[PDB]
Write an enzyme that holds these catalytic residues in place. Structure first.
Site, mmCIF file in Angstrom:
data_model
loop_
_atom_site.group_PDB
_atom_site.id
_atom_site.type_symbol
_atom_site.label_atom_id
_atom_site.label_comp_id
_atom_site.label_asym_id
_atom_site.label_seq_id
_atom_site.Cartn_x
_atom_site.Cartn_y
_atom_site.Cartn_z
ATOM 1 N N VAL A 171 0.810 -1.221 0.000
ATOM 2 C CA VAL A 171 0.000 0.000 0.000
ATOM 3 C C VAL A 171 0.845 1.273 0.000
ATOM 4 O O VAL A 171 0.371 2.334 -0.407
ATOM 5 C CB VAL A 171 -1.035 0.030 1.165
ATOM 6 C CG1 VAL A 171 -2.046 -1.114 1.003
ATOM 7 C CG2 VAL A 171 -0.361 -0.033 2.501
ATOM 8 N N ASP A 192 1.254 7.333 14.311
ATOM 9 C CA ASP A 192 2.686 7.117 14.281
ATOM 10 C C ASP A 192 3.435 7.845 13.114
ATOM 11 O O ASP A 192 3.881 8.983 13.278
ATOM 12 C CB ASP A 192 2.726 5.576 14.206
ATOM 13 C CG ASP A 192 4.060 5.020 14.041
ATOM 14 O OD1 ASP A 192 4.919 5.281 14.914
ATOM 15 O OD2 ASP A 192 4.199 4.264 13.051
HETATM 16 O O1 LIG Z 1 -4.836 2.493 7.397
HETATM 17 C C1 LIG Z 1 -3.643 2.729 7.316
HETATM 18 C C2 LIG Z 1 -2.762 2.064 8.286
HETATM 19 BR BR1 LIG Z 1 -3.658 0.993 9.499
HETATM 20 C C3 LIG Z 1 -1.437 2.266 8.240
HETATM 21 O O2 LIG Z 1 -0.668 1.608 9.184
HETATM 22 C C4 LIG Z 1 0.750 1.766 9.091
HETATM 23 C C5 LIG Z 1 1.239 0.942 10.240
HETATM 24 C C6 LIG Z 1 1.319 -0.430 10.127
HETATM 25 C C7 LIG Z 1 1.746 -1.191 11.189
HETATM 26 C C8 LIG Z 1 2.112 -0.587 12.372
HETATM 27 C C9 LIG Z 1 2.040 0.784 12.486
HETATM 28 C C10 LIG Z 1 1.595 1.544 11.425
HETATM 29 C C11 LIG Z 1 -0.845 3.137 7.255
HETATM 30 C C12 LIG Z 1 -1.658 3.749 6.381
HETATM 31 N N1 LIG Z 1 -3.026 3.557 6.409
HETATM 32 C C13 LIG Z 1 -3.857 4.241 5.449
HETATM 33 C C14 LIG Z 1 -3.906 3.599 4.111
HETATM 34 C C15 LIG Z 1 -3.959 2.228 3.997
HETATM 35 C C16 LIG Z 1 -4.003 1.660 2.743
HETATM 36 C C17 LIG Z 1 -3.997 2.453 1.615
HETATM 37 C C18 LIG Z 1 -3.947 3.822 1.735
HETATM 38 C C19 LIG Z 1 -3.898 4.400 2.986
#
Ligand SMILES: O=c1c(Br)c(OCc2ccccc2)ccn1Cc1ccccc1
Ligand SMILES: Fc1ccc(-c2c[nH]nc2-c2ccnc(F)c2)cc1
Ligand SMILES: Fc1ccc(-c2c[nH]nc2-c2ccnc(F)c2)cc1
EC number: 2.7.11.24
Length: 341
Positions: free
Chosen positions: A27, A165
């Site tokens: 992603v 984060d």
């Molecule tokens: O919904 C989330 C998450 Br949920 C994320 O988590 C990053 C992460 C992963 C593991 C540990 C800490 C942070 C990052 C972006 N996004 C937004 C996003 C997700 C997919 C496509 C576009 C935007």
């Protein structure tokens, strides 16, 4: 006991993850790692899996890796990203050179949403309420986010929101004027400034302060909020900063009611409170939650505060192997949260 891992290459990055996580799909990427969406076979939910890049490359990277793991292990709040799982394919400390973090997939951020969109007041109320509710919790652990911007706000199809984060345009656009000035004793309200800038953009469809650099950024801010009054001027230690600021053509604070013309007057009132120039006078996250703008959402019994957070490691000067061992300890001691519908 150890699960079965499997290896694959996605976008010139190797991902080695337990078989429980399926259908990895990239992603994005956010400075300190890469993220894949996956399917968590244990819960049946979609998760985001972040692989940290070069976690032990230097003291800085090693301490940054430790910091992120510690932070994410601590954050247990509906509006803040936390951990479902932490793993490494390493079977020993000497093997240890990769960290994967997993959280529930929200699936979009406010960068994606803002773009080509002006939002109705009701959705702005709900989004900003959630941000403030998450911030109240973070600030109660004596943490300052410092880098709040739309890309750091992860949102699902229900418009539920969690503070990231690190996220996946210009960061300076959302940054408090005291940080542009380089003040080293800024407080938690730097984050409140950021939320004001984000709220403004959601209501209007435009970046409140689209500065081209730090100087332009300060100048645009002062045009809205006025050049410093005398009370604020006296708090500026730097001679060069004060000479500079006081050599600018002096400016009144604008009437926000004129600037954010079509907006809900309760929305303008909160914005005025969030974007006061002197940071000692800005509204806190807890105070903002009690503002009338959020009357349909505010419940003082469901706006919890964080457990105590030990940030003492931040002062410490350790060897890369020491940061590494501490991080490894934190991976091994991780206790997942329980499954609950
Ligand atoms: O919904 C989330 C998450 Br949920 C994320 O988590 C990053 C992460 C992963 C593991 C540990 C800490 C942070 C990052 C972006 N996004 C937004 C996003 C997700 C997919 C496509 C576009 C935007
Ligand atoms: F209860 C279950 C059992 C297996 C699955 C499943 C579906 N696809 N892949 C798996 C899988 C493969 C390897 N290890 C593990 C899970 C989902 C739920
Ligand atoms: F042009 C300006 C002047 C002052 C600020 C400011 C806002 N809140 N706090 C400060 C501040 C306090 C003490 N020392 C400083 F350097 C800055 C921001 C921009």
């Amino acid at each position: 006991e150890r699960p079965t891992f499997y290896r694959q290459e996605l976008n010139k990055t190797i991902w080695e993850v337990p078989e429980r996580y399926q259908n990895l799909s990239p992603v994005g990427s956010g400075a300190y790692g890469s993220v894949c969406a996956a399917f968590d076979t244990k819960t049946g939910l979609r998760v985001a899996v972040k692989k940290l890049s070069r976690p032990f490359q230097s003291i800085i990277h090693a301490k940054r890796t430790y910091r992120e793991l510690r932070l994410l292990k601590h954050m247990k709040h509906e509006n803040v990203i936390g951990l479902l799982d932490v793993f490494t394919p390493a079977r020993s400390l000497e093997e240890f050179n990769d960290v994967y973090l997993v959280t529930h997939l929200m699936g979009a951020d406010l960068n994606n949403i803002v773009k080509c969109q002006k939002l109705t007041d009701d959705h702005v109320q709900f989004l900003i309420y959630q941000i403030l509710r998450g911030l109240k919790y973070i600030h109660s652990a004596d943490i300052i986010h410092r880098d709040l911007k739309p890309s750091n706000l992860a949102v699902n199809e229900d418009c539920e929101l969690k503070i990231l984060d690190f996220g996946l345009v210009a960061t300076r656009w959302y940054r408090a004027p005291e940080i542009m000035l380089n003040w080293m004793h800024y407080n938690q309200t730097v984050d409140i400034w950021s939320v004001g800038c984000i709220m403004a953009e959601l209501l209007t469809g435009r970046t409140l302060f689209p500065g081209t650099d730090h100087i332009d950024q300060l100048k645009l801010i002062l045009r809205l909020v006025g050049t410093p009054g005398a009370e604020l001027l006296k708090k500026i230690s730097s001679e060069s900063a004060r000479n500079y600021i006081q050599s600018l053509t002096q400016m009144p604070k604008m009437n926000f009611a004129n600037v954010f013309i079509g907006a809900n007057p309760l929305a303008v009132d909160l914005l005025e409170k969030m974007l006061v120039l002197d940071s000692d006078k800005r509204i806190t996250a807890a105070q903002a939650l009690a503002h009338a703008y959020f009357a349909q959402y505010h419940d003082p019994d469901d706006e919890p505060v964080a457990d105590p957070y030990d940030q003492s490691f931040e002062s410490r000067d350790l060897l890369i192997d020491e940061w590494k061992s501490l991080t490894y300890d934190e991976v091994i001691s991780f206790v997942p949260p329980p499954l609950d519908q």
